């Protein structure tokens, strides 16, 4: 627990310190990619991947789910 909360605190540090201009982009990206549609995306030939800013580090996952 002591070791895990150390890497848990990094996301809170990188989140509470975000600037307002970054927060606008973050909220826009979060709302834009809230839900997906395989049908229309496949029809257009494109795949909508989550942006890198919207990826939590694997060390705070329930035990590691990179996929």
């Amino acid at each position: 627990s002591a070791k895990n909360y150390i890497n848990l605190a990094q996301i809170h540090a990188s989140e509470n310190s975000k600037s307002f201009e970054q927060i606008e982009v973050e909220r826009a990206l979060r709302k834009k990619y809230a839900r997906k549609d395989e049908d229309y995306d496949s029809m257009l030939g494109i795949t909508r991947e989550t942006p890198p800013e919207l990826i939590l580090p694997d060390n705070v996952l329930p035990g590691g789910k990179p996929v």
Partner: protein, 138 residues
């Protein structure tokens, strides 16, 4: 007698269409049904429709069906002793006699032109529907 044998063969092909063993032979008999039907229309005197039946039915619809099947696997009594000589022919109207095509095109695009545009809209619906459903594009 040409009508009787042609109609009988068309009827047999149509019957075998619905009781076929495999879809390929079903489509093959489906083509023969329209072949006989076009011949029958040709006997009727409408050459234009008789050949549109080749162009559309066994030209595009039959090809489409075959493509899909390939993958994804009071009367007058017959007494005519004194009627073949009682034919009165009005020669007026034989001069400048139009065909089945000129007559049809005279009034298809000019008087009844709304229905023509409705058929165009039907074709557009078909074209759009064939795309929205089947574009996987993976």
């Amino acid at each position: 007698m040409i009508l009787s044998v042609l109609s009988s063969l068309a009827l047999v092909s149509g019957l075998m269409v619905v009781r076929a063993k495999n879809p390929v032979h079903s489509v093959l008999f489906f083509i023969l049904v329209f072949c006989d039907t076009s011949g029958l229309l040709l006997l009727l005197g409408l050459d234009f429709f008789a050949m549109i039946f080749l162009v559309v039915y066994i030209g595009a619809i039959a090809v489409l069906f075959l493509f899909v099947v390939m993958m994804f696997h009071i009367p007058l009594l017959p007494t005519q002793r004194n009627t073949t000589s009682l034919r009165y022919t009005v020669y007026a109207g034989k001069v400048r006699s139009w065909t089945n095509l000129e007559t049809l095109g005279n009034l298809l695009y000019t008087y009844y032109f709304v229905w023509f545009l409705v058929s165009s809209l039907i074709l557009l619906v078909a074209m759009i529907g064939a795309i929205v459903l089947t574009m996987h594009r993976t």
